[PDB]
Design a protein around this ligand. Structure first.
Ligand code: CHL
Ligand code: CHL
Ligand code: CHL
Ligand code: CHL
Ligand code: CLA
Ligand code: CLA
Ligand code: CLA
Ligand code: CLA
Ligand code: CLA
Ligand SMILES: CC1=C(/C=C/C(C)=C/C=C/C(C)=C/C=C/C=C(C)/C=C/C=C(C)/C=C/C2=C(C)CCCC2(C)C)C(C)(C)CCC1
Lengths: 201, 225, 194, 35, 31
């Protein structure tokens, strides 16, 4: 069996708890997983590198101050910024964020015409035409690789939901919570935190 | 050893005599309808499995509501803090929690329910039963069907199912199930809002009915505003 | 094909089919047919772990990190008990998966085999050199290259043992040649009967 | 070092291990059917 | 003066070879 766990891939199955409904729901699922995966690994890396929890990283960069981000990146040869000048600013990045992500979005979904105009079809999660220069889509069992990615997608989203609920309850951070649990698993758990209260009880 | 294969001819210690239906011919005049007898009033019927899921959550929430009720009546400890008693450390306290108990789970001294001991027994018993109920493990009782919430063989030793009308009893259980689940939801929301047990909230609401309500505690912000 | 010495006779169950098969099994450990795939996979595993160990020892030694025998005592983020619990869980899961895959089931294969074989020899060498001289592998190599003539295994504390073993290895195939040409090679017993 | 190690290994080797293997092996051979 | 460890282990390895030769002789006798 390809998918021995509880649920099954959309292509074949029944979706036991929630009905399958639209196929756009499956499109969203994959995209949510492909995103949350990047989010979870980014929160992991930010906690490991800087010790700053992900959920307050936005406090760092603000309209008045967005210079602190420059010195955070570990092992960089020169800063992010022009040193004292600190050209990077919240708005400086924001205009860049909105234009670049909006272009990437729209050329993905087909709100605007595809610039690549290379036969790629919008509304498919797996293009496999240009976004795989390495050819791992072409080679190997492509369907099995869709399965693995899906599994990683669902795991990462569930871990993301865990991360947000741990940020709400513990207020410490994902990796800080991981270190607390590993240092002592018996007396550092969700139920131990509930016994102590989540800061509200 | 030879094969005897005699006739047991044993009867149930108690076997309820036919009592039929004790309900009106109309069976769900309440909001909504039982599954397999009409259209769901509001929420869409997710799957055929959802009926059995409703039954299981219902029976579990019945048992949970009665447990919180009896625990608070017998000890005064709220159900949501009763977990803090039996822990890997100092699970001795959880023992003497039953009013009138001739003996303690923890005899005086070291003798005691260990959390891990209790836990290990809990996994080995409840998980086994949970699996045997569902398609996991196998079927130790072939005469019964795994995946059926109403087996009604060895699981009704008193034979109320066959003694009365089966389907009215089924809907009666379903109504009790939905009532207890909604009551359980009320209990968790009350625990969140007031930080006091269900019977404590009941007593506060009956001593002075006009105050000690949702909106009275909301006037204080549920202790958060 | 070339065997484990010029003039050797490969065992009948070692016909060159397996990768790295040089007809070396004097003690007939792989003589039983059903355990021979298991022994192959034990070789591949011990080789792979020795290869990884050789890499992690030589790089550690050459990068100034604590010595391989001392590396346990270094202060790490996680204590011994939690680390061994992590190890037990993850290696149990991974080895369960490896076992079930094994139950399910040329150039590169042979390459891997030879590499693992060299590694296991090299790792045994590192452990023995440390146990005899107390010098790490790169320090031991530098000591040897400084005075190659007199600084060696056969001049260490176990020198006479090594000289006797090399004499046994050098004089084994000559006796095997006599055994072949004089005896019939019709042994009904094997050095490990199972 | 030989004096502090080898007795404690070889006395069980010759008086518990070798006897066990030898008796088991001899048993397996003696009871081995002719064919 | 006690015997050196290398002396003990060399003699023991010579004994192991002698034991191998004894096994060869026993097998040859059994034929
Ligand atoms: C689009 C995705 C995206 C998401 C999910 C978040 C999510 C977050 N941001 Mg970020 N941001 C995102 C993009 C961006 N942020 C920023 C700049 C900031 C700042 C400046 C701040 C945040 C803050 C926050 C937090 C607000 C919590 C909240 O509303 O209550 C919870 C809400 C839910 C659970 C709703 C679902 C949260 C971790 C704030 C923070 O760190 O608060 C402590 C903060 O001050 N973000 C920029 C630059 C323009 C972004 C660009 O796309
Ligand atoms: C070229 C020298 C240089 C060196 C030695 C390091 C060294 C390090 N960086 Mg840095 N970085 C360097 C340049 C840069 N880093 C960053 C941005 C980051 C990020 C975003 C991350 C690192 C991370 C890391 C660590 C693991 C990287 C691996 O591979 C390590 C401490 C990772 C880390 O510590 O997170 C756990 C990480 O996530 N670096 C940028 C800008 C893109 C660099 C540009 O020159
Ligand atoms: C034999 C004497 C004995 C007596 C007189 C009582 C008396 C009582 N017990 Mg206790 N118990 C006794 C033995 C035991 N009880 C328990 C475990 C419990 C539980 C689990 C519960 C009671 C409950 C009750 C009350 C139920 C009243 C009716 O209905 C009452 C105060 C009930 C209660 O607390 O109601 C609020 C209840 O739920 N008892 C055990 C262990 C199995 C006992 C063993 O000897
Ligand atoms: C291939 C596996 C393996 C080998 C050959 C050794 C070998 C050794 N360890 Mg161990 N260890 C091994 C696995 C492990 N050790 C440890 C933790 C330690 C510590 C903490 C220490 C040793 C030490 C030692 C030495 C015995 C005294 C020797 C060098 C000691 C040593 O020599 O360090 C100074 C020491 O202090 N080991 C862990 C972590 C759980 C291991 C995980 O598998
Ligand atoms: C026949 C001669 C003989 C006899 C009777 C003994 C007797 C003994 N030896 Mg010694 N030994 C001998 C020869 C002999 N040894 C030789 C030639 C060597 C090699 C140099 C050793 C090396 C040796 C060591 C290193 C140690 C002993 C130990 C021992 C003691 C018991 C443990 C043991 O059996 O391990 C013996 C270990 C072996 C590896 C086997 C060696 C036996 C020889 C080489 C073969 C003899 C076989 C015999 C003639 C025929 C057997 C067939 C049949 C009759 C059973 C015991 C006092 C141990 C001890 O002192 O414990 C307190 C110990 O540590 N022996
Ligand atoms: C938002 C992301 C997302 C999306 C769009 C989907 C969509 C889908 N999944 Mg995927 N999945 C997700 C999350 C998601 N899932 C996560 C996190 C897990 C891990 C538990 C899974 C695990 C999973 C399995 C194992 C299976 C599916 C299946 C399906 C399909 C059936 C359900 C459906 O159509 O309704 C989609 C409806 C929703 C996504 C709404 C969910 C609403 C609940 C209430 C969410 C609860 C968490 C919520 C975010 C909490 C709020 C937090 C907030 C307070 C901050 C569909 C294609 C099944 C399938 O393909 O069948 C063939 C299948 O077998 N998925
Ligand atoms: C988890 C328990 C549970 C389950 C599995 C079901 C399942 C079912 N019910 Mg039952 N029911 C329940 C609870 C539940 N109900 C409760 C508590 C009540 C009393 C209010 C009812 C009252 C009721 C009636 C009156 C009827 C049904 C019907 C049905 C069926 C159709 C609905 C459906 O498939 O979607 C199920 C979908 C859901 C349960 C999703 C709703 C989720 C909301 C947001 C509630 C979440 C609760 C809470 C706020 C969570 C807190 C989280 C915590 C972290 C704070 C199905 C068998 C109908 C039927 O049989 O049709 C023929 C019907 O007529 N039920
Ligand atoms: C008040 C709640 C209530 C009601 C009305 C029912 C009603 C029914 N159940 Mg359910 N059941 C409940 C609670 C309830 N049960 C709980 C909490 C559990 C978990 C322990 C179960 C577990 C269960 C199983 C496993 C089975 C039933 C079966 C039955 C049927 C006949 C036996 C029976 O309980 O007679 C009614 C008895 C009473 C009303 C007395 C309740 C008070 C006692 C004395 C305490 C009937 C539909 C059987 C069935 O449907 O098979 C055809 C069956 O196999 N029930
Ligand atoms: C079977 C259902 C049930 C029952 C009998 C009760 C009964 C009670 N509740 Mg609970 N409650 C319930 C469901 C229920 N509740 C649910 C579903 C919620 C979440 C919406 C709540 C949330 C809640 C809070 C927050 C509080 C109560 C309180 C109370 C008490 C006061 C009555 C009141 O203000 O009306 C409560 C009725 C509702 C809120 C109707 C909700 C229906 C949708 C009383 C003991 C109060 C208390 O502790 O009294 C001192 C209190 O502070 N209840
Ligand atoms: C690994 C190791 C070890 C071990 C080792 C060993 C185990 C060794 C040994 C050695 C040996 C083990 C030796 C032996 C020898 C023997 C001999 C030398 C014998 C002889 C015999 C004889 C001579 C007999 C004969 C006969 C008989 C009686 C029968 C038949 C007939 C005939 C005649 C054949 C230890 C742990 C310590 C340490 C670490 C390393």
């Amino acid at each position: 069996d390809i998918y021995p766990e509880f649920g099954t891939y959309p292509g074949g199955g029944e979706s036991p708890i929630i009905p399958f409904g639209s196929e756009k729901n499956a499109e969203r699922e994959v995209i949510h997983g492909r995103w949350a995966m990047l989010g979870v690994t980014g929160a992991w890396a930010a906690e490991n590198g800087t010790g700053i929890p992900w959920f307050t990283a936005g406090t760092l960069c603000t309209p008045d101050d967005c210079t602190a981000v420059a010195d955070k990146f570990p092992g960089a040869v020169a800063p992010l910024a022009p040193e004292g000048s600190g050209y990077p600013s919240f708005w400086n990045v924001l205009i860049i964020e909105i234009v670049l992500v909006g272009a990437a979005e729209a050329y993905r979904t087909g709100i605007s015409d595809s610039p690549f105009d290379d036969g790629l079809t919008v509304g498919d999660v797996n293009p496999g035409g240009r976004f795989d220069p390495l050819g791992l889509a072409e080679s190997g069992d492509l369907e099995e690789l869709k399965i693995k990615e899906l599994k990683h997608c669902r795991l990462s989203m569930f871990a993301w939901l865990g991360c947000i609920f741990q940020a709400l309850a513990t207020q410490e951070g994902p990796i800080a919570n991981w270190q607390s649990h590993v240092a002592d698993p018996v007396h550092s758990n969700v139920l131990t935190n509930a016994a102590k209260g989540f800061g509200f009880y | 050893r030879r094969t005897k294969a005699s006739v047991p001819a044993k009867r149930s210690a108690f076997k309820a005599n036919k009592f039929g239906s004790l309900a009106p011919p109309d069976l769900y005049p309440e909001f909504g309808t039982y599954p397999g007898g009409g259209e769901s009033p509001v929420i869409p019927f997710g799957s055929e499995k959802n009926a059995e899921r409703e039954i299981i959550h219902g029976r579990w929430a019945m048992l949970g509501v009665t447990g919180a009720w009896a625990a608070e009546n017998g000890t005064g400890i709220p159900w949501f803090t009763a977990g803090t008693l039996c822990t890997p450390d100092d699970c001795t306290a959880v023992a003497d929690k039953f009013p009138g108990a001739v003996a303690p789970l923890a005899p005086a001294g070291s003798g005691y329910p260990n959390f891990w001991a209790v836990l290990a027994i809990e996994i080995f018993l409840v998980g086994s039963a949970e699996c045997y109920r569902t398609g996991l493990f196998e079927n130790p009782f072939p005469e019964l069907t795994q995946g059926d919430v109403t087996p009604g063989g060895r699981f009704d030793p008193l034979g109320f199912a066959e003694a009365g009308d089966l389907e009215e009893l089924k809907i009666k259980e379903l109504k009790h199930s939905r009532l207890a689940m909604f009551a359980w939801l009320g209990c968790i929301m009350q625990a969140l809002a007031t930080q006091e047990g269900p019977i404590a909230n009941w007593t506060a609401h009956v001593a002075d009915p006009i105050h000690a309500n949702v909106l009275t505690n909301a006037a204080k912000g549920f202790k958060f505003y | 094909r070339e065997l484990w010495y010029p003039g050797a006779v490969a065992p009948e169950y070692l016909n060159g089919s397996m990768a790295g098969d040089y007809g070396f099994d004097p003690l007939r450990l792989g003589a039983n047919v059903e355990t021979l795939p298991y022994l192959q996979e034990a070789e591949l595993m011990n080789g792979r772990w020795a290869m990884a160990a050789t890499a992690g020892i030589l790089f550690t030694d050459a990068t100034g990190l604590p010595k391989w025998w001392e590396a346990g005592a270094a202060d790490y983020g996680y204590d011994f008990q939690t680390l061994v619990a992590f190890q037990v869980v993850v290696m149990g899961v991974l080895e369960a998966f490896r076992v079930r895959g094994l139950m399910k089931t040329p150039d590169k294969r042979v390459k891997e085999v030879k590499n693992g074989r060299l590694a296991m020899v090299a790792f045994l060498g590192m452990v023995s050199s440390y146990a005899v001289t107390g010098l790490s592998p790169l320090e031991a190599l530098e000591a040897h290259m400084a005075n190659p003539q007199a600084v060696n295994l056969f001049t260490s504390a176990v020198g006479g043992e090594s000289v006797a073993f090399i004499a046994f290895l050098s004089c084994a195939p000559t006796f095997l040649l006599a055994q072949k040409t004089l005896g019939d090679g019709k042994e009904e017993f094997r050095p490990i009967p199972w | 070092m030989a004096a502090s190690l080898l007795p404690s290994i070889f006395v069980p080797l010759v008086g518990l291990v070798f006897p066990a293997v030898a008796m088991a092996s001899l048993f397996l051979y003696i009871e081995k059917e002719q064919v | 003066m006690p015997l050196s460890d290398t002396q003990v282990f060399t003699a023991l390895f010579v004994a192991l070879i002698t034991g191998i030769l004894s096994l060869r002789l026993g097998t040859q006798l059994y034929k």
